[PDB]
């Protein structure tokens, strides 16, 4: 603070998220970064102890899930990727790839 | 929050941003109510529910909430404020809103 | 902060005519624009603008041609808003010039 | 707008020992009260008071007596909630003064 600066503005800042678990059908795991998909955000809200409800992945059916997922996968193709422009702050991590699924949720 | 309020305008002393602006128009709303219902800022003296941690899924603009503020011993003007943003292990942070005017210009 | 009056020393060059200077930490709050201190003898209060804010440097006020006597000091500190602050009152038994002018002619 | 330096002329009556006067637009923003630029030298910057608002009118200041060299200003726009602009930055080879004064007795 000084002869400028003379009162602290409000700070906000624009996170990336929290990094869920993404099930893959031949059954590796992958959790290293956030993920669009409605489905997988639901499964990480409803697998955590910490904040929601403590349901264990032993009541899932994985494969059901996985494919059901996929659902929400599916490419549209009504738009162009070159139509947004501020394709880094939707969720999109690279202009070059499809990044076109039906449904996006952030 | 007390500690920070004596580094602020008269105004905005004791505010902070509400997390979520928009929640969803359903059947259970009518659209006066519901467009007069959402807020922009929340006052924190007397709202003991804006100071939960949120949990953010992709790219999100969230306010943040204080923890911690304290100045310097010798440099009484130099001050250290500490705000939590999110939950769990987020991805990072994209960009931070020192005012109303993002710190990487549109 | 620390609101105290300095008697001028015994001989210096320039300062003719100059009784002591007043001098003041800033005030904590960072949003005030000047000070408004109110000698007792004066009708109008001295208005120190702040301009450069340093916590740890002290701003004065000198006193030029008050005889001496019982003066009676308020120092107060205005915000951009017009709110004042609590008046810091100080009487100093003010001393004579000790910095004379020379004779002329 | 448009922050520039113009230096003073050869010869002209008056002006002595003058350097060149800074010129700008005032700002867009129409509740601006004054402007703080701030020379490198000088321990305090000068203060220049908008009291009368043409946007196509430039406002000077100009330099007395500052030796020739290495001279950085920065100019900002103060409002009346005390909110300052983000400054404008201008290094010039600030030169000599070229209306000296007189030959005196």
């Given at each position: 603070i000084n002869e400028n600066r003379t009162e602290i503005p409000e700070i906000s800042a ?93 | 929050t007390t500690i920070l309020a004596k580094y602020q305008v008269k105004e905005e002393r004791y505010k902070l941003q509400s997390k979520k602006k ?14 007069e219902t959402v807020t922009k800022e929340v006052d924190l003296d007397f709202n003991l529910a804006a100071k ?9 603009k969230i306010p943040g909430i204080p923890i911690?503020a304290?100045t ?5 003007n130099?001050v250290?404020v500490v705000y ?12 931070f809103y020192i005012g109303d005017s993002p710190?990487?210009?549109? | ?26 005030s904590l709050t960072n949003n005030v624009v000047y ?15 702040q301009?450069?804010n ?22 107060r500190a205005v915000d951009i808003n017009g709110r004042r602050s609590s ?19």
């Open positions: 624009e996170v990336q998220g929290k990094k869920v678990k993404v099930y893959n059908s031949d059954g590796t795991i992958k959790a290293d970064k956030t993920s669009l998909n409605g489905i997988w955000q639901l499964m990480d809200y409803l697998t955590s102890d910490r904040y929601g409800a403590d349901i264990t992945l032993d009541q899932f059916p994985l494969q059901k899930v996985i494919s059901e997922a996929k659902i929400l996968d599916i490419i549209d193709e009504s738009y162009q990727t070159s139509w947004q422009p501020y394709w880094r702050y939707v969720g999109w991590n690279d202009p070059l790839s499809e990044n076109r699924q039906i449904v996006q949720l952030n | 928009l929640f969803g128009l359903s059947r259970s709303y009518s659209l006066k109510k519901y467009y939960f941690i949120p949990v953010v899924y992709g790219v999100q911690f304290d310097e011993l010798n440099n009484p130099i250290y939590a943003f999110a939950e769990g292990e987020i991805d990072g942070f994209l960009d710190m990487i210009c549109f | 902060r620390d609101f105290k009056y300095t008697p001028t020393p015994g001989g210096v060059v320039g300062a003719i005519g100059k009784n002591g200077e007043l001098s003041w930490l800033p000070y408004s201190i109110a000698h007792s003898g004066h009708v109008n209060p001295y208005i120190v603008q301009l450069e340093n916590p740890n440097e002290r701003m004065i006020q000198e006193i030029i041609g008050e005889p001496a006597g019982l003066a009676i000091f308020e120092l008046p810091v009152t100080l009487s100093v038994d003010l001393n004579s010039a000790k910095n004379l002018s020379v004779v002329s002619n």
